[PDB]
Design a protein around this nucleic acid. Structure first.
Lengths: 62, 62
DNA sequence: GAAATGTGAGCGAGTAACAACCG
DNA sequence: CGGTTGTTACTCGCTCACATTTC
């Protein structure tokens, strides 16, 4: 099982690898068109957000 | 803070970040004195290995 | 000037490589 | 002769911070 990443989703959606990250946490300062693109791309690739790295970026709230 | 970073340990022990992991690796070119120095910070600071970080660092643990 | 997206760096830890250095 | 230490960054997978962009 290949661990999908936001890079896969963003590339497929046609956006920056960050755009997919903003929807998973808040989604402030984003256009609906960009958001739908992001969400549909993550479902098609069956990408699962890796929480290990999510908290790694400066959180660790578990 | 109990779960400190290896950088935190490296500093306390008075060594490099390279030798700090070496002690844990318990296989590299690690001198006896070196491990004693490092393990001191480990206990004093209570180094806790982050499964998420260790795995993200290139260790396919998940 | 502010929304929005892209560019970029940082986080945590592990590992890799050669060369100098003292024992 | 050689065991050993080191710097420094890469790299994961992510997310925030900022720079740019444009109206």
């Amino acid at each position: 099982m290949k661990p999908v990443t936001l890079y896969d989703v963003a590339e497929y959606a046609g956006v920056s690898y960050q755009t997919v990250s903003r929807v998973v946490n808040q989604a402030s300062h984003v256009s609906a068109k960009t958001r739908e693109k992001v969400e549909a791309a993550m479902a098609e690739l069956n990408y699962i957000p890796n929480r290990c790295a999510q908290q790694l970026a400066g959180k660790q709230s578990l």
